[PDB]
Amino acid sequence: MELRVGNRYRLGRKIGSGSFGDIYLGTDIAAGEEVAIKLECVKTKHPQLHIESKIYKMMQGGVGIPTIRWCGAEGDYNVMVMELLGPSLEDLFNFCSRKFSLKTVLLLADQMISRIEYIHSKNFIHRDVKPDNFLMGLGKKGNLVYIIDFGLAKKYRDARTHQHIPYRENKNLTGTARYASINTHLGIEQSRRDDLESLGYVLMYFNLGSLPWQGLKAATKRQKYERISEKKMSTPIEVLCKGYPSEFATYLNFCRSLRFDDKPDYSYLRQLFRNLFHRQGFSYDYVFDWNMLKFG
Amino acid sequence: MELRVGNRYRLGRKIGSGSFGDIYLGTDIAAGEEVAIKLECVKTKHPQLHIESKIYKMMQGGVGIPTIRWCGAEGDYNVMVMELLGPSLEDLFNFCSRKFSLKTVLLLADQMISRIEYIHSKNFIHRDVKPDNFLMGLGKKGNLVYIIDFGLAKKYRDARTHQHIPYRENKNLTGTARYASINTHLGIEQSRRDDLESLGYVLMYFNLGSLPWQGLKAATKRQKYERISEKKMSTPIEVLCKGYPSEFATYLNFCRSLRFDDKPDYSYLRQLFRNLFHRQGFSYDYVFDWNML
């Protein structure tokens, strides 16, 4: 027979995986809406999915935040049902043969910095900023970048008093070593500035095709991240951003300078890229590389 | 047979002397890792080790604080094993022909000011700030400045009431006289302002290569101190910092004006240098002087 979670959610193909497990394609039969079901094995060891849902619900209403359909349990699984979105930026990147033009990077950067700014206004740091955790909407929302996966996210200040978490060393879960900030590598607690730094890397990855510390291929020993850490701290911003508009190097440097508790000047950051956008004479249409690909 | 402390670490070369003990090289036989061993003879008239191990423990979790591995009582000694770290800022200074470039000095100044700030948030004052008490980490943490040696550390306010300690004078000089603040030389009770003033002299030591009171000939130690104090008190900060970015002069001045119980504004003090780092067009890379050799 057919497999249906909840009652209304027809389970489907395994379309991917996230932090708390796998992401399956599903269908709300009682509504005919294709949705995304994420299910974590009831008792793994650290049942973090009931936590992620909480965050999504705190962010509910924000621009570019996926809507949650249902949260609950079904046997050996606790399922979260959320809005199915378009391809991730990684998919689109590969789709474009791993080549984003400056305009698209600038067009994207503007929205990515806004999603990041929003999570922070709600007292949280994302902690795992990568091209996979951003998706494009569908249909009418086709030009809006969405931010997903609040698995490694953390509250960085009291939601009432707004008192920032203290400066100490990390005793938590880390994200992708490839887009990690230098502090993450130094073993320091992550905060607002670190989310923006990784973005600097995501942006440079989109411009470069791949990062310099990417694919070092180390030995069988436990830490390959030691090489990444090194390659990363040894590669100066001026060399990394070589051959590109200074706004990118100026972006990374600024983020590196910020103190653990400084509130970032987001507008300044949006300002750098917009000025460059207007300079190169770009129209602010939401026509991206992947839209032009249909004509060659 | 082989010298084995607590049946866990083999003892090695004495690599120095802490505030009240000797630091020996050690090897966690099991994990093979290199550690640092501090020893205090049980028959000491002024046991501090049990006090110091406690302080390191309170400090645990802070950025740049060394880890204590084990504490044990051997036959004739009390033992405190802690993680071994990299070279100190003195060993690197000397390695670098005793010359630190502006950005290396600024990049360190920021971390050094963070550590002191941290300790103060824990209700303690270091009271012996010098380059020897600052060590770089190992491997990936090799870009992190650590603070060590809490042997002379004193609590400056109640752990609960936060009632700052009383003003007292006629005290004795505590710490290296070369970096000791003018107040320390005047036998005045130490507080937060003193830890930061001394850090000031440490920065200029890195800039200048030597300090105006360093090298005075004297036989008697109190005579030594008397001379050092004289030169120090008689050397204008404006003159001292001659030719270096005013920020340093601004720093020492600020420090020498905080009232005894004043809560230093560590952000302003850091903002000076971060602003200077910025005006010099310095970029944020973790490559230091010693890395260009």
Swiss-Prot record, chain B:
Chain ranges of the Protein kinase domain: 9-277
GO molecular function: ATP binding; kinase activity; protein kinase activity; protein serine kinase activity; protein serine/threonine kinase activity
UniProt modification remark: Autophosphorylated on serine and threonine residues; this autophosphorylation represses activity. Reactivated by phosphatase-mediated dephosphorylation. May be dephosphorylated by PP1.
Ion transport as UniProt keyword: no
UniProt key word rRNA-binding: no
GO CC annotations on file: centrosome; ciliary basal body; cytoplasm; Golgi apparatus; nucleus; perinuclear region of cytoplasm; plasma membrane; spindle
Name assigned to this protein: Casein kinase I isoform delta
Source organism of this protein record: Rattus norvegicus (Rat)
Gene, per the UniProt record: Csnk1d
Part of the whole protein covered: 1 to 293 of 415
